[model samples]
Target: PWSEFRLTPAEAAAAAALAARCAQRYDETDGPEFLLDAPVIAHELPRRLRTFMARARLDAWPHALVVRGNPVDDAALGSTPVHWRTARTPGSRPLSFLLMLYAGLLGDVFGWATQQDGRVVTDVLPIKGGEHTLVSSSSRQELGWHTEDAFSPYRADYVGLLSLRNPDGVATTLAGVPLDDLDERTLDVLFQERFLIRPDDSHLQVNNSTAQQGRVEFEGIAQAADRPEPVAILTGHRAAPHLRVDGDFSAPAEGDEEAAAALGTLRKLIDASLYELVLDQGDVAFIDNRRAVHGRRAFQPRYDGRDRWLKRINITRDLHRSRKAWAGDSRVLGQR
Candidate 1:
């Protein structure tokens, strides 16, 4: 049901050595200079990890690729930040570079111009007053399952997360299409372009900065928020079609009762089949965005310095596929 790889002690040490070198060479992970060079440094990583990554790219059976056994010391890493805005603490700085280096093996990494101030390497942590909100910072309410950037054609092909600390072991939820339980009619509707998926709250003006709000890239997000076109929730071969839908943002085409029924049925199937996966310290998982929808489980937030924290980055198989969405020559993506 799951695919995982653990780095041997020697392999883990060697990988860490490379990341340390990258950290020394590059002051920031998001800069163009680092983005261009990380992949070259990544090529020198352990051969076993490279092999696993290559095979994982070709196989579609596992919805995610989990890598474990990297080294992390709490004292050396420092306390988790209270908010994502100030999350780039010195302790967690090295891991940020480590995550980018690993992401290099998969593909070109990118970020949203309208998310987290357009930083390619972003932070995920519980915020003090945001426990009930719909964004990743929410701790009390369950983050509803959704395809990453479900509303856009230029969404991530893979969503990567590197867990730095998780004391309570809160779970990340995942569910693929329940083909065995779905009716043929409902399945047929899902495969057709009979649905609408609007951009989520994370892309809203309030979620971004003043600078981003006025950028040309953000105009595309605003336009999408105002007028999103209809798209299919499923595509490709019927037996193993790709999935795309935001549980909180998706809706049926106006007045389409059959499409509505299909979406409703889909919601139930996903809920029934949803399962949990816990990512401990030094664990990294790159979820195949096309194969499944994902979310986080509801849990009580602890503001006492030690909270769950993860470094996140997005990846794409072909950067040129979204050339139309590129903000000139930048890695930050948006519709033109």
Candidate 2:
């Protein structure tokens, strides 16, 4: 379920102008100057938008907070890049800035040390060779639902995605916990720490660029995959519990048959409950990582350059919640 907010043309223009101003003032979104200033700068955005964000975030029933109509012009916004490593085209720069500004309204933005070479403003586009993979770049197979970085304790509170172009209207999938369907026994089992969630393939060295691959953060990913700690799939209050499990990458703890059964039931329930949220050009969504799981449908890649592309950023309500994962002065967090 999403709490939708549509911006008027004037509101959209005002939001875009502020981001445009930031783009002109700063060199990049992840730079120290912009990152430090975006939250304060976001106060200059439309008052209505600011109010909607404040209200919707406290309404626990919503899976996502959606804001449509930020205005993306195709001519001004050039073709999507072939790979995320090179997706930072000049045309999409302002949209990236806008995404961060919106993200700042929700919380502090951060990046993974292992994903996309530690870039805070990351790209999401179908890569030619990676079409069959489980990561975000896949086009052939569906990107299965999962909590963002479920293996780590320092996962994002929200995953912000701003769609720059989606000509085909590829639908993004989201599903919350099926509270109405689960029995008391199954619910109790799910709430217990009896599940194992490994890090997704996105963190592997194979996913990162050749030059940026083989970093130390990858070692932590490997460790998590090989020897993951037992954790609960369901947490928080029973009436509206938080979810944390990967559809393709999660498992029950060793010899925990009850956990396995609960997971099996959960998969079935989530599959039935899954719904689409189509984000058109210029629409932005901040998905609640704790409340729901998200994924994408399979689509054939049109490598002709007008493919569906999005700008993504991770946000946390409190930065120091990931203090141990922090390395040096960098905002990027890793297992080190």
Candidate 3:
């Protein structure tokens, strides 16, 4: 379901040097000024990486791209933060800029208005009190596989993750449509617009921002949570259709028996095909949102300073595709 590229010693050193330069120039990764400028600075990265990214963007054979061998010194990187709210520790700050620079090469990076307060460079670490939750902060409970933000048409085209540290070598889960496993009838039904995917808990006001809770911009999220529209689970060519479904949130639309049956079969197929991929230290992966669904495998939480931590960013090949969803001049997205 993915492609892997290992950087040579020289390539890795060159990329790290570029990231260091970017860090020196930008004080914060989430600022609008840095978000707009990172791509320009990223052009100085090694040609090998640029070529790979260009080819990966055009090809569809791999569902994701994994770039390994970026140097991460544990001593300099420091311990993982206690929670997402306090994840912006000095140790992990440079890596945030590194993630943004890498993401800039692939596409226009953006953030969710209803997630992590719309921070473009977001943190993913196991929170002490949120171990069993459905969101990314969970550790003990398996994060169910889903297309990133499946409820919205304006969701990211790619989900980028830069692993800062993972001492346990925990695996990320992924599964694509099992075309051979599904019969023509079930596959056909899945292609029709007869399924519903509601906004996940991460988008709720309690999890996001309180200030925007009563704003008109947030009305779309509220409405989607209250009454989601029916949409197709599979789209495009039947032989290799694009998939969009949240295992935890997807449901059949209004008593459609065929769609329900198809969805049930899809769940089984996806579960059967689920496989694991571990992102070790100094690794980065860009998951193709349309090609596959991804999640994290459950593992014991180690809050003793050396837990798994990843810096995540969202990318889109065409920023204009979601222009209607943009909130004013901000990168934060909401329904028009």
Measured against the true structure, the TM-scores of the candidates, in listed sequence, are 0.97, 0.98, 0.96
RMSD of each: 1.2, 0.9, 1.4
Off by over 4 Å in 2: 328-330
Clash pairs, model 2 backbone: none
Worst 10 residues of 3 by lDDT: 208-217
Ranking of all candidate structures by their TM-score, best first: 2, 1, 3
Candidate 1 steric clashes: 0
lDDT of 2 at 135: 96
What is the lDDT of every predicted structure here? 0.89, 0.93, 0.88
Superposed Cα deviation of residue 216, candidate 2 (Å)? 1.8
lDDT digits (tens) for residues 10-31 of candidate 3: 9999888877777777778877
For model 3, state the Cα shift of residue 292 in Å.
0.3
Residues 1-336, model 1: lDDT tens digits:
457999999999999888888888887998889999998989999999999998987886888999999999999998889777788888888899989988999999998878888889998899888888889989999999999999999899999999999889999888887888987898899999999998898888787766667767777877887787888999998999899999999999989999999999999999999999899999999998999899999999888888999999999988888888887355888764
Ten-residue region with minimum lDDT total, candidate 1: 327-336
Query: Model 2 over residues 49-85: C-alpha lDDT tens digits?
Result: 9999999999979999999999999999988899998
Please identify which of the two predictions, 1 or 3, would achieve the higher TM-score against the true structure. 1
lDDT of 1 at 230: 81
Ranking 1 against 2 by TM-score, winner? 2
